[PDB]
Write a protein that binds this ligand. Structure first.
Ligand SMILES: Cc1cnccc1CN1C[C@@H](c2cc(F)c(F)c(F)c2)CC1=O
Length: 472
């Protein structure tokens, strides 16, 4: 009972300090810096989903190897999400984000020069492992600098960079891969892979300049470092707004108080702490919340990734009844249609609340998925896919905000990483099942996705409201 009281007091004082610091130049600079990593994650997702399964350039593997090539990377993303989310609660958000981005960059760079299918598979798997940790770390890292007044809108604006990365990867694919003349053992897919690694390098370079989260310092006994970071934030914000004469008034902050053999014992202790943090998410205080979160994350991920592999095959069926450029253009349109949903969700998140956003978006996504069964031509299918994505992204934004706000700071990245790993597993399962339903029928995939979305909405209706409360 003592620890909960002390952490509530710390949360109240931290909210007061953030109100004193204000929102301004520092927050937007960090926003762009973390948006770079989100863009890197979007680029990785596009590459894995479209060009990675040897569309035309590689063609050095069997069809079974083509299917495995993507799913193993999704499994690596799941593993990396869990690992880096767990480690971020013990080592820090900035440290683990830097390590994961470095691993992703190194192995993405390595995969460009390898001359073998096995080595390419290994490098892409480890790149996925490195990149899987971005979202859970980034969202918590940015949330730990935001006051409660407009926290939801600021968190929702962060989702634009995933779409930006998808667009960047689509344009680079469109420009590079068809130009086979750029080959010099070397081909154009290697140039594309090399170019796709630039956003991660830029993210690392920018992130080197930003400080560690002061909330992590306060939760771990490092009062002075947190005070220095908060004073830096306050000074930057006040100098930007034209009041450099103002003095940071905070004095004291509530604080929650061979070599390889030592490496081994340290690793064992760290793994034990991570496992304890994971198991504490199923305790009596959080078990019901965690179970409801698992259902909403799983059903939404299962439906989206199931439809997005079913959709291109259905277009191919329509084209039979009626080029890589069409693939690039369709992927670009599908990722571009997300923008209005992101804008509207960012503008309405704090006005109407996370719960109403999630419920309405889930209902609209289910309705649009059911409407997908009425497709009769390529153009109508493209429009319906754009509509579905635009109406569905808002549920993902609201779920990000809820996951950020539903867990305490000492387990936030662990819970987020577990949920993101569950999402990657759901993506794997949905891709496998909807590929197993390639031509057997048409009603069944649509019905399955609609039922999953309805179950997700039903579970989302039962979540608690976190709006208007200090960040626990
Ligand atoms: C931002 C984010 C937050 N949490 C977990 C994962 C992510 C990244 N996303 C976005 C999701 C998405 C939803 C849509 F409806 C679309 F139309 C679309 F193109 C993409 C799927 C994914 O991988």
């Amino acid at each position: 009972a003592q620890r909960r009281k002390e952490r509530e007091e710390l949360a109240q004082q931290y909210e007061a300090i953030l109100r004193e610091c204000g929102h301004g130049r520092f927050q937007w600079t960090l926003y762009f810096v973390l948006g770079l990593a989100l863009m890197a994650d979007g680029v990785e997702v596009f590459v894995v989903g479209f060009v990675l399964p040897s569309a035309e350039k590689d063609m050095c593997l069997s069809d079974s190897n083509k299917g495995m090539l993507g799913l193993i990377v999704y499994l690596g993303m799941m593993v990396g999400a869990f690992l880096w989310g767990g480690l971020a609660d013990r080592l820090g958000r900035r440290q683990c984000l830097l390590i994961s981005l470095s691993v992703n960059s190194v192995f993405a760079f390595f995969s460009s020069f390898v001359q073998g299918y096995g080595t390419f598979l290994f490098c892409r798997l480890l790149s996925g492992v490195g990149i899987g940790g971005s979202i859970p770390i980034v969202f918590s890292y940015f949330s730990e600098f935001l006051a409660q007044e407009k926290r939801g809108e600021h968190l929702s604006w962060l989702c634009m960079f995933w779409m930006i990365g998808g667009v960047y990867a689509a344009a680079m694919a469109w420009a590079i891969i068809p130009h086979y003349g750029w080959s010099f053992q070397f081909h154009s897919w290697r140039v594309f892979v090399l170019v796709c690694a630039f956003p991660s390098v830029f993210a690392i370079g920018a992130l080197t300049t930003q400080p560690e989260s002061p909330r992590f310092f306060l939760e771990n006994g490092k009062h002075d470092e947190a005070w220095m970071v908060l004073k830096q934030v306050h000074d930057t914000n006040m100098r930007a707004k034209g009041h450099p004469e103002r003095v940071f008034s905070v004095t004291h902050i509530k604080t929650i108080h061979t070599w390889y053999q030592r490496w081994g014992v340290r690793a064992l202790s760290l793994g034990g702490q991570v496992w304890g943090n994971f198991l504490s998410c199923f305790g009596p205080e959080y078990r019901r919340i965690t179970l409801m979160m698992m259902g909403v994350w799983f059903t939404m991920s299962f439906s989206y990734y199931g439809l997005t592999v079913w959709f291109p095959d259905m277009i191919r069926h329509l084209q039979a009844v009626d080029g890589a450029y069409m693939v690039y253009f369709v992927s670009f349109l599908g990722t571009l249609a997300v923008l209005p949903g992101n804008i509207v969700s960012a503008l309405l998140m704090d006005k109407i609340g996370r719960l109403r956003m999630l419920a309405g978006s889930s209902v609209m996504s289910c309705v649009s998925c059911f409407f997908l069964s009425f497709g009769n031509s390529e153009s109508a299918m493209i429009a319906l896919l754009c509509l579905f994505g635009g109406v569905s992204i808002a549920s993902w934004n609201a779920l990000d905000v809820l996951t950020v706000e539903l867990y305490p700071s000492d387990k936030r990245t662990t819970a987020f990483g577990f949920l993101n790993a569950l999402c990657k597993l759901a993506a794997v399962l949905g891709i496998s099942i909807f590929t197993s339903f390639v031509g057997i029928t048409k009603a069944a995939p649509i019905l399955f996705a609609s039922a999953a979305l309805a179950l997700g909405s039903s579970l989302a209706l039962k979540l608690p409201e976190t709006r208007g409360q200090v960040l626990q």
